Design a protein around this ligand. Structure first.
Ligand code: NAG
Ligand code: NAG
Lengths: 19, 49
């Protein structure tokens, strides 16, 4: 429903620490 | 520019993002405007008419 949105990646403060 | 033209140098900013700013300034989250943008636009146009 959001117009003008672009695809990108977000960081997670839990995945690198758990893995 | 929004409100920056009255407090210093003018800064360009899209009008939907300015509306999201003004909605977040009163307590309403920006998602209701970023999702139901067409409805708000139609209501504003009907009010102006
Ligand atoms: C971006 O601007 C162009 C030119 O005004 C317009 O044709 C297009 O619909 C705009 N796109 C969005 C997502 O507002
Ligand atoms: C974003 O990703 C989806 C799925 O990969 C794709 O359908 C869409 O065209 C992409 N949009 C952009 C901004 O490139």
């Amino acid at each position: 429903v959001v117009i003008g949105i672009v695809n990108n990646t977000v960081y997670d403060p839990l995945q690198p620490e758990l893995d | 520019s929004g409100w920056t033209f009255g407090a210093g140098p003018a800064l360009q900013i899209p009008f939907p993002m300015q509306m999201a700013y003004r909605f977040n300034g009163i307590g309403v989250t920006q998602n209701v405007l970023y999702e139901n943008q067409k409805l708000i636009a139609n209501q504003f146009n009907s009010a102006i008419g």
